[model samples]
Target: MGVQVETISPGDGRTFPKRGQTCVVHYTGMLEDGKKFDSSRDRNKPFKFMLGKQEVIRGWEEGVAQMSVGQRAKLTISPDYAYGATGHPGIIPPHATLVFDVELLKLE
Candidate 1:
């Protein structure tokens, strides 16, 4: 319920990829102040995970589920759906509201 998505670009996909499929994305994550914490593009690699297996944060699940392949969106996630009480040790702070610019590169 804490997830908000703004579509930057639309995709033609009609079905939402489910739990068992592999979903790949490229994203830039920032703090509320617009401070960049991490980005997949900088690494020259996309992040891959299984949607419902907890491989990523709860926000990714909720947000990306509403998206389709080739879709790009800006996602705002509450602490409840993000890193929460225990954030990444040196990256994000606890109870942080996270912003992510994400693109769904693949879902299969």
Candidate 2:
């Protein structure tokens, strides 16, 4: 069955992943003002990571696990799920919430 990743999970509200599952994503990251700061679509190579690992952020680790290879979702990460109140500095602002439109290119 296909899952609608747009919907936030309700249990933990997320499906925690097991070790070793990796995923590649084509994403467009933007600020709350809708001003885009980064885009993987132009880069041509999707960002990749292993679920349940330290390759990415907490929200990503939990959020992407519910998706299968080829699935797509809009991931809205809270500050706590992202870089925290201090933020990522110049790249990301302080106490900011991040939104990512991600396509799960592959998962294994």
Candidate 3:
């Protein structure tokens, strides 16, 4: 799976986090047509994950793997990178190209 990431807002930081580090992220997920599916802000919480640990989708792992803390970017994920033949049921359809506006909040 390949991910195309565009930096919407750049973060001023000397270094980005590496794999195995815990990263806190706030994100809004939507379809290609701009229909929203999920959002961290709507849940009033940020998502936490240990990088490169397969805790999330392949696109997520590939997209923000190199992001600096406080960086904001948009990731365009192909179906191969997102939900493939078996989609997210009601949330996401099969072969759906996902769009995500993501911000890296913290690392631990």
Candidate 4:
């Protein structure tokens, strides 16, 4: 199969510490105008993370269980699925739908 996600998952991975099972991710986060904000792929190495933990954004971890170690996905995250109305300033705006070209490199 191409790929898919769980119907729903808890929206909290923001509390986990950094020393748990680590996850390596390759991603390109962009805005609606196709302007780039961040890109792990450009860095040449995958971004490391602790599995089942937050370290990133809420929407990320919620959809993680739906992915495999080597799976890649194109994610269109709505504000409800993202940071909600508060949003991330200086990076993401209010009620933003985040676009991500994501690859799950590993979980260690």
Best by lDDT: 1
Clashing pairs in 3: none
Residues 8-100, candidate 2, lDDT per residue (tens digit)? 223333334467866767888876677787899989988878776778877777777865556567777788887777887688899777787
Positional deviation of residue 97's Cα in model 3 after best superposition, in angstroms: 0.3
Which residue runs does candidate 4 get wrong by more than 4 Å? 1-20
Score each candidate by Cα lDDT: 0.90, 0.70, 0.88, 0.65
lDDT of 1: 0.90
Query: How big is the positional error of residue 44 in model 1, measured in Å on the Cα after superposition?
Result: 0.8
Worst 10 residues of 4 by lDDT: 1-10
lDDT-wise, the better of 2 and 4 is 2
Per-candidate Cα RMSD to the true structure, in Å, reads 1.2, 6.2, 1.2, 7.7
Error of 2 at 52 (Å): 1.4
Q: Where is model 3 more than 4 Å wrong at Cα? A: none
lDDT of 2: 0.70
Clashing pairs in 1: none
How many clashing residue pairs are found in candidate 2? 1
